[PDB]
Amino acid sequence: DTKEQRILRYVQQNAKPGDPQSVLEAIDTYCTQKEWAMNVGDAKGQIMDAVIREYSPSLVLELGAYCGYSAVRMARLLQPGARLLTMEINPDCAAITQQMLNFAGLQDKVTILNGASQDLIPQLKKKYDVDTLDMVFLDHWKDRYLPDTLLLEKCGLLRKGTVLLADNVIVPGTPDFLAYVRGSSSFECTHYSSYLEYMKVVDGLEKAIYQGP
Ligand SMILES: O=C(NCCc1nnc(-c2ccncc2)[nH]1)c1cc(-c2ccc(F)cc2)cc(O)c1O
Ligand SMILES: [Cl-]
Ligand SMILES: [Cl-]
Ligand SMILES: [Mg+2]
């Protein structure tokens, strides 16, 4: 099988159904002790939690679900009725994410979309009944952070105060995105220094709050 399937099986055999915290713990244990994987991890995840709690977003978009770790992390902190839409390019990983969320008991809060961001973002309003997004978590292909931010704006999905939170801005790095948001009067930026998941390598999250045109 694949590493992603092994992670799902480990969760199913080492976590409690309907208990998101136990799911996160199981993933982090597996990826620390058995096989590394590109989940956001607990160090960056704690920063994510602090941001989600500050803003209590009603509608979140995640670009790049992977196995659903971050989706579990965010969805467990959403208020009743709040929703997460998450996009995963790899069909096998999209199916694993769905199963992960089902196991966690968070399936009613989350919609997992299988496809490419450049294709799905323009469909969000009409197909998924989105008006504007409260928060966007960027964790997909690193060379897409900038073009997809611009696409979100073009599509009218950003409002004053929409929070963009971007993983991996140091490793693998997203230099064009960082330069752009930090140099733009349309964003108010903050850097949260941390570590690459499961590693003693510096990474960080960037928060970029959209300010309108
Ligand atoms: O590549 C990464 N994530 C991207 C995952 C994705 N899933 N679906 C989409 C998608 C969805 C719609 N459109 C386009 C792409 N993208 C990624 C890679 C690393 C990493 C770090 C150091 C290494 F040595 C090797 C790899 C770390 C991370 O935290 C990552 O997030
Ligand atoms: Cl993740
Ligand atoms: Cl970690
Ligand atoms: Mg990442």
Say which CATH number the domain at 166 has.
Answer: 3.40.50.150
Report residue 64 as tokens.
């790049």
Q: Are strands 163-166 and 83-88 parallel, antiparallel or unpaired?
A: unpaired
Query: Taking the chain, what is the end-to-end CA distance rounded to the nearest angstrom?
Result: 48
CA nearest 139: which of 84, 100, 199?
84
Q: Is the CB of 112 under 6 A from ligand 1?
A: no
Q: CA 104 to CA 90: how far, in whole Å?
A: 21
Element spanning 192, H or E = strand 187-195
Structure determination technique employed: X-ray
CA nearest 88: which of 61, 48, 55?
61
**In 3-state terms, what secondary structure has residue 159?**
coil
Q: CA 206 to CA 189: how far, in whole Å?
A: 7
Q: Which domain holds residue 86?
A: 1-213
Are 19 and 26 in contact, with CB atoms under 8 Å apart?
no
Q: Which ligand is nearest to the CA of 93?
A: 1
Instruction: Report CA(25)–ligand 3 centroid distance (Å).
Output: 11
Q: Is the CB of 55 under 6 A from ligand 1?
A: no
Amino acid at 198: Y
Distance, CA of 30 to chain centre: 20
Q: CA 106 to CA 90: how far, in whole Å?
A: 21
Instruction: Report CA(4)–ligand 4 centroid distance (Å).
Output: 15
Are 46 and 67 in contact, with CB atoms under 8 Å apart?
no
Name the region of 87 (left: φ>0; alpha: ψ -120 to 50; beta: rest).
beta
Q: CA 203 to CA 117: how far, in whole Å?
A: 23
How many separate domains does the chain show? 1
CA nearest 67: which of 45, 95, 108?
95
Instruction: Report CA(187)–ligand 1 centroid distance (Å).
Output: 24
